[PDB]
């Protein structure tokens, strides 16, 4: 289930609201959020996605 | 025998019980323990994290 991940990624979003993130960063942030939802976050390449995020 | 992950997890927990594990170290152990259960028993990655654990 992605409900636990949805809560985890939401915690990342709320802290992001306290800083004025540049628009160019949003493209990487949004694509990493999408990549986070399509991966189980348990693998060699799965962990680096949240690590980058 | 019983489940390998359950036996491995129980034995590793007892070893960490005596030591005053730091907060960040505990998170690293906890996250790899969760991925240990879902990993295949004969998988090569299973041995990699088992030695790391």
From Swiss-Prot, chains A, B:
Compartment list = Mitochondrion matrix
Residue ranges the record marks as coiled coil: none
Q: In which tissues is it expressed?
A: Duodenum, heart, lung and liver, but not thymus.
Pathology noted in the record is: CODAS syndrome: A rare syndrome characterized by the combination of cerebral, ocular, dental, auricular, and skeletal features. These include developmental delay, craniofacial anomalies, cataracts, ptosis, median nasal groove, delayed tooth eruption, hearing loss, short stature, delayed epiphyseal ossification, metaphyseal hip dysplasia, and vertebral coronal clefts.
Quaternary state and interactors = Homohexamer. Organized in a ring with a central cavity. The ATP-binding and proteolytic domains (AP-domain) form a hexameric chamber, while the N-terminal domain is arranged as a trimer of dimers. DNA and RNA binding is stimulated by substrate and inhibited by ATP binding. Interacts with TWNK and mitochondrial DNA polymerase subunit POLG.
Description of its domains: The Lon N-terminal domains are crucial for the overall structure of the protein, maintaining it in a conformation allowing its proper functioning. The AP-domain (ATP-binding and proteolytic domains) has a closed-ring conformation in the presence of AMP-PNP and its N-terminal entry gate appears closed. Upon ADP binding, it switches to a lock-washer conformation and its N-terminal gate opens.
As for family, the record states: Belongs to the peptidase S16 family.
Function, as annotated: ATP-dependent serine protease that mediates the selective degradation of misfolded, unassembled or oxidatively damaged polypeptides as well as certain short-lived regulatory proteins in the mitochondrial matrix. Endogenous substrates include mitochondrial steroidogenic acute regulatory (StAR) protein, DELE1, helicase Twinkle (TWNK) and the large ribosomal subunit protein MRPL32/bL32m. MRPL32/bL32m is protected from degradation by LONP1 when it is bound to a nucleic acid (RNA), but TWNK is not. May also have a chaperone function in the assembly of inner membrane protein complexes.
What is the recorded name of this protein? Lon protease homolog, mitochondrial
Source organism of the structure? Homo sapiens
Q: Summarize which stretch of the complete protein this chain spans.
A: 410 to 462 of 959
